[PDB]
Amino acid sequence: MATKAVCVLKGDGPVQGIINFEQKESNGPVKVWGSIKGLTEGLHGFHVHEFGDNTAGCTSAGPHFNPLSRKHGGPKDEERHVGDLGNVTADKDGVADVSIEDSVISLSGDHCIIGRTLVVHEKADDLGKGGNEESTKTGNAGSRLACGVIGIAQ
Amino acid sequence: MATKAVCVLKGDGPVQGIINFEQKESNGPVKVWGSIKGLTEGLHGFHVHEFGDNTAGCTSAGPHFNPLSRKHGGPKDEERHVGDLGNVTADKDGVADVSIEDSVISLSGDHCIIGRTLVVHEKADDLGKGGNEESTKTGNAGSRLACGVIGIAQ
Numbered sequence: 001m002a003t004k005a006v007c008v009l010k011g012d013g014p015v016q017g018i019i020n021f022e023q024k025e026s027n028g029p030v031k032v033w034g035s036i037k038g039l040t041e042g043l044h045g046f047h048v049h050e051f052g053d054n055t056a057g058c059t060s061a062g063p064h065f066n067p068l069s070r071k072h073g074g075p076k077d078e079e080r081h082v083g084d085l086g087n088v089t090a091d092k093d094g095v096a097d098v099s100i101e102d103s104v105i106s107l108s109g110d111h112c113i114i115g116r117t118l119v120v121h122e123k124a125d126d127l128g129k130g131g132n133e134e135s136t137k138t139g140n141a142g143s144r145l146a147c148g149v150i151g152i153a154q
Numbered sequence: 155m156a157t158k159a160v161c162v163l164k165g166d167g168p169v170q171g172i173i174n175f176e177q178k179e180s181n182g183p184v185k186v187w188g189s190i191k192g193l194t195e196g197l198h199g200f201h202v203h204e205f206g207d208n209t210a211g212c213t214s215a216g217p218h219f220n221p222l223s224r225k226h227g228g229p230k231d232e233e234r235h236v237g238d239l240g241n242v243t244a245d246k247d248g249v250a251d252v253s254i255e256d257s258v259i260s261l262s263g264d265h266c267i268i269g270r271t272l273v274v275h276e277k278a279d280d281l282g283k284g285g286n287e288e289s290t291k292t293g294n295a296g297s298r299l300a301c302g303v304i305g306i307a308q
């Protein structure tokens with residue numbers, strides 16, 4: 001079906017960005033790339049949450065997109081949420097030049113992320129290896145700095 | 155698959171609102187309801203545009219969602235874009251209490267509007283009866299006051 005998507009991230013603070021998604025083959029991986037600025041230096045959790053609902057800001061996006069009812073993990077784990085895209089790294093200038101390729105999310109079918117919410121988080125995702133209950137749900141990535149609904153792009 | 159959706163309308167000016175979508179059966183009508191504030195009194199074109207792309211504001215959402223390559227019409231016409239939901243009416247307090255039911259838009263399938271952009275326009279939609287070229291494309295509804303990507307709702 002859809003081969004290109006885009007997401008404009010906004011929030012209450014200075015974090016903002018544009019993230020592109022491209023899936024040339026419906027059964028192949030999704031490329032994810034773009035730039036997020038306004039971030040503190042270092043790692044930031046980068047997740048697709050379940051709902052494309054911004055009525056109460058990023059909170060109403062709900063939890064991680066998890067159609068298979070699994071535990072939070074890193075993108076390379078078998079045990080992961082579909083929305084578990086791991087971390088993005090912001091440099092010393094506050095810019096995260098995102099470049100991710102993922103073969104679990106899709107722009108079509110049951111794992112489709114169109115119309116859900118991409119969220120960039122306050123802290124690093126511990127990829128489910130943090131030893132607490134929060135690690136297996138959110139990776140301890142903390143609060144939602146910016147988000148946007150993932151839309152169909154030209 | 156998706157039976158509920160939601161859209162948060164924002165723009166450069168004061169227009170803002172929340173629109174809900176609900177489709178109990180995939181072969182059935184979509185109920186569209188909610189509230190838009192900050193509008194001048196009277197009719198405002200109300201359309202699903204093709205792209206869920208807000209990278210340059212509402213302009214990047216593209217033209218009306220039109221997979222059947224038809225001319226613009228009102229919602230009751232057989233010749234209409236899928237995205238042609240006609241007008242909403244703002245009262246003297248600037249509020250449009252939207253309440254629409256449409257069987258051409260869907261929350262699934264070919265006519266799925268999830269991941270596309272809802273736009274509320276500056277002027278009335280002439281429902282394709284204006285007799286100029288613009289009427290058959292946009293209904294002469296004028297500029298885009300506010301928009302949002304339509305996202306999956308809980």
Ligand SMILES: [Zn+2]
Nearest residue numbers: 064072081084
């Ligand atoms: Zn997760």
Ligand SMILES: [Zn+2]
Nearest residue numbers: 218226235238
């Ligand atoms: Zn139209």
